[PDB]
Design a protein around this ligand. Structure first.
Ligand SMILES: CC1(C)CCC(C)(C)c2nc(C#Cc3ccc(C(=O)O)cc3)cnc21
Length: 137
């Protein structure tokens, strides 16, 4: 089961609502929402080892992880966090995050590969769930 590829977005819901729960300044939220409408997502997968680059004109993130092993990244609001990804099923990985400092809403994410050429990202903050769907470019 192979997440590798260059992905572009087709659907998004609750991205703005997610940033709102995390308390992102309303002006920065409006910029992020604009940027997030047109991302380029590059995934390189070798077994359980992943590289994910999410590029927009405003902000680019790169994460490196191995399913089952602790790593560090940022929350979607830009706060350093400790992360752990596990397989929920053959096609779906789930990630729990803990802030390195401070408190804030409980955040997590999932990535799922469908049988019809889609990649589904969810990102959660307390009980706001953002769902983003991508297809290969
Ligand atoms: C205004 C500024 C610089 C700073 C505030 C935050 C919220 C950190 C920010 N976030 C984004 C984004 C995004 C994004 C795109 C795509 C995806 C995806 O996975 O498709 C996720 C997040 C942009 N700009 C900002």
């Amino acid at each position: 089961p192979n997440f590798s590829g260059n992905w572009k977005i087709i659907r998004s819901e609750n991205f703005e609502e997610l940033l709102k729960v995390l308390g992102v300044n309303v002006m920065l939220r409006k910029i992020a929402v604009a940027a997030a409408s047109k991302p380029a997502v590059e995934i390189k997968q070798e077994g359980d080892t992943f590289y994910i680059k999410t590029s927009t004109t405003v902000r680019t993130t790169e994460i490196n992880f191995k399913v089952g092993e602790e790593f560090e990244e940022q929350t979607v609001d830009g706060r350093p966090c400790k992360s752990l990804v596990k397989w929920e099923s053959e096609n779906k990985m789930v990630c729990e995050q803990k802030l390195l400092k401070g408190e804030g809403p409980k955040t997590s994410w999932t990535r799922e590969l469908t049988n019809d050429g889609e990649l589904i990202l969810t990102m959660t903050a307390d009980d706001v769930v953002c769902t983003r769907v991508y297809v290969r470019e």
